[PDB]
Design an enzyme around this catalytic site. Structure first.
Site, mmCIF file in Angstrom:
data_model
loop_
_atom_site.group_PDB
_atom_site.id
_atom_site.type_symbol
_atom_site.label_atom_id
_atom_site.label_comp_id
_atom_site.label_asym_id
_atom_site.label_seq_id
_atom_site.Cartn_x
_atom_site.Cartn_y
_atom_site.Cartn_z
ATOM 1 N N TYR C 122 0.815 -1.219 0.000
ATOM 2 C CA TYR C 122 0.000 0.000 0.000
ATOM 3 C C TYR C 122 0.849 1.269 0.000
ATOM 4 C CZ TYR C 122 -4.021 -2.907 1.238
ATOM 5 O OH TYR C 122 -5.037 -3.830 1.314
ATOM 6 N N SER C 155 6.457 -4.993 4.383
ATOM 7 C CA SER C 155 6.926 -6.083 5.239
ATOM 8 C C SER C 155 6.786 -7.414 4.537
ATOM 9 C CB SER C 155 6.151 -6.179 6.561
ATOM 10 O OG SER C 155 5.996 -4.923 7.143
ATOM 11 N N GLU C 237 -7.154 -6.868 9.421
ATOM 12 C CA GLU C 237 -5.870 -6.579 10.027
ATOM 13 C C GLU C 237 -6.009 -6.111 11.462
ATOM 14 O OE1 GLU C 237 -2.900 -4.810 6.960
ATOM 15 O OE2 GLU C 237 -2.309 -4.037 8.935
ATOM 16 N N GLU C 364 -4.744 9.176 14.934
ATOM 17 C CA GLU C 364 -5.431 10.472 14.770
ATOM 18 C C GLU C 364 -6.640 10.362 13.836
ATOM 19 O OE1 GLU C 364 -2.131 10.104 14.905
ATOM 20 O OE2 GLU C 364 -1.088 11.880 15.726
HETATM 21 C C1 LIG Z 1 7.338 -1.797 10.605
HETATM 22 C C2 LIG Z 1 6.398 -1.305 9.662
HETATM 23 C C3 LIG Z 1 5.664 -2.256 8.912
HETATM 24 C C4 LIG Z 1 4.767 -1.829 8.003
HETATM 25 C C5 LIG Z 1 4.562 -0.461 7.847
HETATM 26 C C6 LIG Z 1 5.268 0.465 8.608
HETATM 27 C C7 LIG Z 1 6.213 0.020 9.518
HETATM 28 C C8 LIG Z 1 6.969 1.014 10.306
HETATM 29 N N1 LIG Z 1 3.598 -0.033 6.920
HETATM 30 C C9 LIG Z 1 3.454 1.429 6.661
HETATM 31 C C10 LIG Z 1 2.310 2.059 7.505
HETATM 32 O O1 LIG Z 1 1.107 1.681 7.034
HETATM 33 C C11 LIG Z 1 2.569 3.628 7.374
HETATM 34 O O2 LIG Z 1 3.734 4.006 8.079
HETATM 35 C C12 LIG Z 1 1.351 4.413 7.839
HETATM 36 O O3 LIG Z 1 0.348 4.208 6.905
HETATM 37 C C13 LIG Z 1 1.768 5.897 8.028
HETATM 38 O O4 LIG Z 1 2.161 6.389 6.781
HETATM 39 P P1 LIG Z 1 3.510 7.300 6.961
HETATM 40 O O5 LIG Z 1 4.478 6.416 7.584
HETATM 41 O O6 LIG Z 1 3.801 7.925 5.605
HETATM 42 O O7 LIG Z 1 3.210 8.497 8.072
HETATM 43 P P2 LIG Z 1 2.613 9.902 7.638
HETATM 44 O O8 LIG Z 1 3.733 10.823 7.274
HETATM 45 O O9 LIG Z 1 1.390 9.788 6.712
HETATM 46 O O10 LIG Z 1 1.931 10.467 9.082
HETATM 47 C C14 LIG Z 1 2.956 10.530 10.038
HETATM 48 C C15 LIG Z 1 2.294 10.953 11.364
HETATM 49 O O11 LIG Z 1 1.512 12.201 11.045
HETATM 50 C C16 LIG Z 1 0.277 12.234 11.829
HETATM 51 N N2 LIG Z 1 -0.896 12.369 10.967
HETATM 52 C C17 LIG Z 1 -1.087 11.896 9.654
HETATM 53 N N3 LIG Z 1 -2.259 12.261 9.149
HETATM 54 C C18 LIG Z 1 -2.866 12.988 10.150
HETATM 55 C C19 LIG Z 1 -4.127 13.603 10.210
HETATM 56 N N4 LIG Z 1 -4.982 13.563 9.171
HETATM 57 N N5 LIG Z 1 -4.513 14.262 11.324
HETATM 58 C C20 LIG Z 1 -3.597 14.255 12.336
HETATM 59 N N6 LIG Z 1 -2.360 13.706 12.432
HETATM 60 C C21 LIG Z 1 -2.025 13.081 11.292
HETATM 61 C C22 LIG Z 1 0.326 10.917 12.663
HETATM 62 O O12 LIG Z 1 0.944 11.309 13.947
HETATM 63 C C23 LIG Z 1 1.191 9.996 11.820
HETATM 64 O O13 LIG Z 1 1.669 8.991 12.636
HETATM 65 C C24 LIG Z 1 3.252 -0.929 5.904
HETATM 66 N N7 LIG Z 1 2.671 -0.434 4.727
HETATM 67 C C25 LIG Z 1 2.353 -1.285 3.649
HETATM 68 O O14 LIG Z 1 1.855 -0.816 2.602
HETATM 69 N N8 LIG Z 1 2.621 -2.637 3.836
HETATM 70 C C26 LIG Z 1 3.191 -3.191 5.006
HETATM 71 O O15 LIG Z 1 3.411 -4.394 5.063
HETATM 72 C C27 LIG Z 1 3.487 -2.249 6.052
HETATM 73 N N9 LIG Z 1 4.054 -2.713 7.240
#
Ligand SMILES: Cc1cc2c(cc1C)N(C[C@H](O)[C@H](O)[C@H](O)COP(=O)(O)OP(=O)(O)OC[C@H]1O[C@@H](n3cnc4c(N)ncnc43)[C@H](O)[C@@H]1O)c1[nH]c(=O)[nH]c(=O)c1N2
Ligand SMILES: Cc1cc2c(cc1C)N(C[C@H](O)[C@H](O)[C@H](O)COP(=O)(O)OP(=O)(O)OC[C@H]1O[C@@H](n3cnc4c(N)ncnc43)[C@H](O)[C@@H]1O)c1[nH]c(=O)[nH]c(=O)c1N2
Ligand SMILES: [Cl-]
Ligand SMILES: [Cl-]
Ligand SMILES: [Cl-]
Ligand SMILES: [Cl-]
Lengths: 380, 361, 380, 361
Positions: C122, C155, C237, C364
């Site tokens: 995703y 992952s 999930e 959030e």
């Molecule tokens: C170990 C591990 C494993 C996986 C994944 C991540 C990690 C670290 N993910 C990815 C995961 O789904 C992804 O990190 C989240 O969707 C967040 O996207 P961003 O990391 O870009 O943070 P992004 O930059 O979007 O947001 C960062 C922070 O901003 C804040 N925020 C965002 N939007 C907001 C709003 N509207 N209002 C208020 N606050 C807001 C929150 O605090 C959020 O945590 C994944 N993905 C995938 O496709 N396949 C997989 O298998 C995995 N597995």
């Protein structure tokens, strides 16, 4: 030096003792600016020289230091007595800055002498947090303004001589640039008020202005420049919240002594809660001290003022909740009912502390400002 | 003036830490055997920063706990891998509670050739004020038997201050790192320090003065709070910058109200941490011995500091757990520091006993 | 009846014991889907019949109950072993719903037998929380799609046979209506991945798609209808996060026993912290149970799913922080270093719990949805 | 089925409470001498709602603690001024632990002519499980001497269950409200109830069975949590509606992210409160006696319930403190309930002792 503050403390107890009785103190302290005997106290304090204690001697005050000023505020609260914070510490100092020489002469001496009390007229039913959307209007007729509108939660309006009134003077300007502060006498024709009772025991008011007429010289500052005055007096409206924290520190101490003497202090959970509130009260009082220094120096930032006010007012509520728990079954007994502890003060203050997280600046908006002004975060 | 000297101190430390606490160098040091940057240590010595808090008779500037806290706060801002608080808290304990013979070790600390650490913790209950490690009289010396837990930054330390209980109660004792009967097992901690689990079998030792132990615990608590203040400040700064850059839904993350409010709560907690830190310093310099101010500073470190680094992890999203991105080190440091000498709940319990005891005085 | 779950528990311990050794369990459990021996375990579990334990028998599974399913998940975690949650509990059940008869025949048996593992594609550098803004594109060439883009934090992509890939198929449609799910083989030409190490010890990946070609029959569901598939698998999930909470409950119990046997349990502060985490774990496990019932019934609301996931993942972090404090000086010792308690599991889980408040839905945004979907609050 | 009966129960209580817990009537009752709505009490009796939780042999429906909790939750939703939990918890204690003579009082409770209250608290430390009030044997009866604190809804109660320590430990004893040696002082509490500080001077009393006291404390904790659940739910509902209406900055307050997040935290806490409540009920009906489930439900009430009503005050701004607007009553009820039988910190301490004791079994 610290002997002087001790001596000041001991003098002020003797003095307030010669005024207060018993429950009366906790009765006039609960009512606040809206209470019957408020003006009676103010006039006594004023003729005895305590109102101008912290004012510059240029304007007839003693010019005493911040340390001494805080001893005074702490001791008035301890005595139960109401103090005209808003009038003496909020309106006078904004007048000293933005008032005409004429305005200062009409108002400051009577404030000093305890003969003039002010009430703040900002909030409207349609304009609370979004104060810059206020619609109470003041229209030019010649050298008079004609004022039409209403305000809500005008504390002390029933006992004040003048309203510090925020009005829309230019309906076509940016909202922040269409406002003026106008002083309205509470005996003016067309002025009226009605009571509002709060869960905390206070009576505030709604105030109404129907064709009220005031000379144009009663505008403070420049016409349509009222927003800088509003902010100036709102910033000075933190020296009161500092003294409020002072009161919660005293109550915390009293609860420690009470729990010591009945064995409640032997409970681990009580000790832990007193430790956590001690630590949060320590940060509050130190932040309050720094911020008072800044504000009386004209150096407080918007970020720091907002962080300190939001932290302090939420800490007052945390301490109120926590001390109520420590009080056990007596924690729920209202003032003047049998079994109340410390005259029910913590019970009644719990019903009032809820106000100050949204009065004097709304803590959500203060957190917005901390982020934008303090950390440079973008808006919108 | 003193503030001007502390400002100069701060700028110097900032430049040195900025030059050496880099992406490349942090990775090199955190995968080494010692986990200690010896180049950074020598640079600090050469700039006089190891001596700034120590006495003039040992070649220092004589600026005490305040200068130490200014240096530690800059160190935490950069998660810079050098054992400043173990060496310099031990050195301040020697300066204030050591014999003449022990104070003769301080010149080597000032000039960078001699490092120290402190062994103040034990496994289990681990009451730092009542060590289970034992001290037995032996002539004008002592022999220590017991174990100490996770002694920080043990590699290259020539001497250790070890807390132990003798016949007259808990005390603090100086031990040479090559003393007979002393051994340790290296153990890697959350922060990636290489600590030592210390075994003492009748180890020869020399006592510090009678007040050394409670004094050293108050100073160590204050010093740890200084590092934590810097960790939280640096974490917040990095996170604020990142949230201006990263956009989702067509705008900077930094514009979302919930994001601004999490950042503000960090700011508030950092301001609270900072004024209580300086109250602890001022109280120590004004001769307070009740311990409350140091525990308040430490609780703010343990609870506020830990809250900050959890919020700055969360606000980064996935990139915040990437070990090639900086913020995760602030999480690791903040988390470890918030438990060092005990965590937030323990500190409230200890503080609550002091309050109760003082009220019953 | 509860004798049956007990017996199931005891059977699964014997079974996992015949597979695990000692530290190996905590070694393959830390790596997760990205670890070397992952496929080795999956294939063993699959041929022994445990992967389809909860699948409908229509699709070759045992059709066992939720109670039994949770015993299985709890025991695999306890053993240290990795379980193919995403592939078996997230992809299979969305395929059973939206797959063609053909798609089911190609994939479900090999999933069942432990021969096919999937990874979720995703997240992009430019599209994380705002997943509906993804730009990885799939363009029609004939009966093939040509896929160009990249994903991040994929992952298991290094150990999977197929990517469940969210792609932009209609660049002119509303963003939610321009997406399709496409299955991409990990041996496809133009597919590549690179490792990303996490502070928690896991290796995930970035994945790259350069001219990758896939038959059009490998689209799951309808073209441009991929958003409902994404949400379906994201809801499933949560059965994993329920099992995660199960693991923290076990660790809480182990810490109680450890503190009992070394006297740490005699400290009032420890007892109070164990009480508070007990109460929060009780609410979590009960909410998880209700929500699992709903999700396997097709009756979970968006408000409840969001409230339960945000509460549970924040509770895992609260418990991690709190148990670390109770562990004292050993709380800071990493797995495999001397003095670690409970093999360092709580230390390592503290470095991983931080992920799940933003993975599987950003807390959030989940709170936004609780307000709008649960309480009817307006947006915008 | 049983759930269908509980649904019918809930709708009936909702209609009755809705008809009588009005702006005008709440003000009339909260300024009266008794603070008790006798009309509401008679309406509840006539609908069979006082009998629904009580045994069939007394004319009730025999639906037990679950039905009681459904009724109490609706009562809290409307802050309806009637002493349901004091009367019905006392009646359930009689039903399950009373003599035949004591159970003969239950018909009068079912039909509305007989109310009760419980005196389970004391000033000071006030350990509810170790009352300082004393019980002395006197023939086949007892005499009680001591004081009890803030007995709820004392006006019109014909009998009280009073906790006291006899020669064989703490117990629960039935007392007639006109007993010789019994007196009280009326005292107004946070919620505006009129409680009584009870003085007992060798007051004649009759014991309930040996398990009555810990059983009654678990049931009372569970019942208080049911009321709190209803208070928090009603507070959240009113606040959600208000935030849709009130606009500032050109839009509903309900659209601000921080507002939505405060509302969501209330929602989460209410869901947690609710599942732990029903676990406590299920545990009591399944014969659990360890007390943990009831304390978990009560802690959620004490901490989550109190958080909710603080947030719903804050979200209203000034109008929320106007006594002519409804929400302030939810604050007063929530606040009082969160301390009844002890507050959140006490409940964690008690729960932690049970956990420790069970682990050392
Ligand atoms: C170990 C591990 C494993 C996986 C994944 C991540 C990690 C670290 N993910 C990815 C995961 O789904 C992804 O990190 C989240 O969707 C967040 O996207 P961003 O990391 O870009 O943070 P992004 O930059 O979007 O947001 C960062 C922070 O901003 C804040 N925020 C965002 N939007 C907001 C709003 N509207 N209002 C208020 N606050 C807001 C929150 O605090 C959020 O945590 C994944 N993905 C995938 O496709 N396949 C997989 O298998 C995995 N597995
Ligand atoms: C006892 C007492 C005494 C006084 C006053 C009030 C009371 C109760 N005040 C009024 C006070 O200043 C006023 O209540 C606040 O400015 C809030 O305005 P509203 O009450 O309209 O809340 P409003 O409806 O604006 O906001 C209500 C709640 O919405 C939330 N909110 C608002 N804006 C938000 C945003 N942008 N982002 C997120 N959340 C947001 C907050 O939770 C806020 O508390 C007053 N006034 C005066 O003129 N003179 C006086 O003397 C006094 N004294
Ligand atoms: Cl005033
Ligand atoms: Cl090692
Ligand atoms: Cl998988
Ligand atoms: Cl009365």
């Amino acid at each position: 030096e610290p002997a002087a503050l001790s001596e000041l403390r001991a003098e002020l107890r003797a003095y307030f003792n010669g005024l207060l009785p018993a429950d009366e103190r906790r009765r006039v302290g609960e009512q606040g600016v809206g209470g019957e005997r408020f003006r009676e106290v103010v006039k006594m304090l004023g003729s005895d020289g305590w109102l101008g204690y912290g004012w510059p001697k240029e304007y007839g005050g003693q010019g005493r230091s911040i340390s001494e000023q805080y001893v005074l505020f702490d001791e008035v609260q301890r005595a139960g007595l109401p103090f005209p914070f808003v009038t003496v510490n909020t309106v006078g100092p904004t007048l000293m800055k933005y008032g005409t020489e004429e305005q200062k002469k009409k108002y400051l001496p009577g404030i000093l002498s305890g003969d003039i009390v002010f009430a703040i007229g900002y909030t409207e039913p349609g304009a609370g947090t979004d104060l810059a959307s206020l619609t109470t209007r003041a229209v030019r007729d010649g050298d008079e303004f004609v004022i039409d509108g209403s305000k809500i939660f005008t504390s002390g309006a029933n006992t004040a001589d003048y309203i510090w009134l925020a009005c829309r003077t230019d309906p076509e300007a940016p909202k922040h640039k269409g406002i003026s502060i106008i002083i309205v006498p509470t005996d003016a024709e067309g002025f009226s008020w009605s009571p509002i009772q709060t869960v905390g025991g206070m009576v505030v008011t709604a105030t109404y202005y129907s064709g009220v007429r005031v000379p144009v010289s009663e505008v403070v500052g420049e016409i349509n420049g009222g927003w800088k005055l509003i902010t100036t007096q709102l910033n000075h409206e933190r020296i009161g919240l500092a003294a409020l924290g002072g009161r919660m520190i005293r109550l915390w101490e009293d609860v420690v002594a009470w729990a010591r003497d009945n064995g409640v202090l032997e409970q681990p959970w009580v000790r832990r809660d007193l430790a956590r509130t001690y630590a949060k009260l320590e940060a509050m009082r130190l932040l309050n001290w720094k911020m008072t220094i800044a504000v009386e120096n004209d150096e407080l930032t918007g970020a720091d003022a907002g962080a300190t006010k939001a932290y302090g007012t939420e800490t007052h509520i945390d301490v109120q909740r926590t001390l109520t728990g420590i009080l056990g079954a007596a924690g729920r007994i209202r003032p003047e009912s049998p079994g109340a502890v410390l005259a029910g003060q913590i019970e009644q203050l719990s019903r009032q502390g809820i106000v100050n997280t949204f009065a004097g600046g709304v803590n959500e908006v203060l957190r917005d400002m901390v982020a934008t002004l303090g950390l440079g975060m973008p808006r919108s | 003036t003193l503030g001007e000297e502390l400002t100069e101190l701060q700028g110097l430390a900032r430049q040195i830490f900025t030059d050496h606490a880099t992406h490349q160098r942090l990775r090199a040091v955190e995968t080494s055997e010692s986990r200690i940057d010896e180049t950074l240590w020598r640079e600090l010595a050469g700039a006089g920063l190891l001596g700034v808090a120590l006495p003039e008779a040992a070649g220092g500037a004589g600026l005490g706990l305040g200068a130490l806290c200014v240096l530690l706060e800059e160190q935490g801002r950069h998660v810079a891998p050098v054992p400043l608080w173990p060496t310099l808290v031990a050195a301040l304990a020697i300066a204030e509670h050591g014999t003449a013979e022990q104070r003769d070790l301080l010149p080597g600390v000032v000039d960078g050739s001699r490092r120290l650490t402190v062994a103040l913790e034990e496994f289990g209950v681990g009451d730092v004020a009542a060590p289970g490690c034992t001290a037995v009289p032996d002539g004008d010396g002592w022999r220590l038997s017991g174990t100490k837990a996770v002694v920080p930054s043990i590699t290259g330390a020539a001497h250790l201050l070890v807390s132990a209980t003798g016949p007259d109660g808990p005390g603090l004792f100086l031990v040479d790192a090559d003393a007979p009967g002393l051994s340790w097992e290296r153990t890697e901690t959350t922060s990636r320090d290489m600590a030592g689990n210390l075994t003492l079998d009748a180890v020869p030792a020399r006592a510090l003065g009678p007040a050394a132990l409670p004094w050293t615990l108050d100073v160590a608590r204050t010093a740890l709070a200084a590092v934590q203040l810097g960790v939280a400040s640096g974490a917040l700064h990095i996170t604020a910058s990142y949230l201006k850059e990263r956009e989702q839904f067509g705008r900077p993350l930094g514009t979302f109200q919930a994001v601004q409010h999490q950042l503000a709560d960090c700011y508030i907690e950092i301001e609270a941490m900072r004024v209580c830190l300086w109250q602890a310093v001022c109280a120590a310099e004004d001769g307070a011995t009740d311990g409350k101010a140091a525990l308040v500073a430490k609780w703010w470190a343990d609870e506020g500091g830990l809250n900050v680094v959890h919020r700055t992890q969360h606000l980064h999203g996935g990139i915040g757990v990437d070990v090639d991105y900086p913020i995760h080190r602030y999480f690791l440091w903040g988390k470890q520091i918030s438990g060092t000498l005990g965590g937030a709940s323990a500190d409230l319990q200890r503080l609550g006993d002091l309050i109760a005891e003082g009220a019953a005085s």
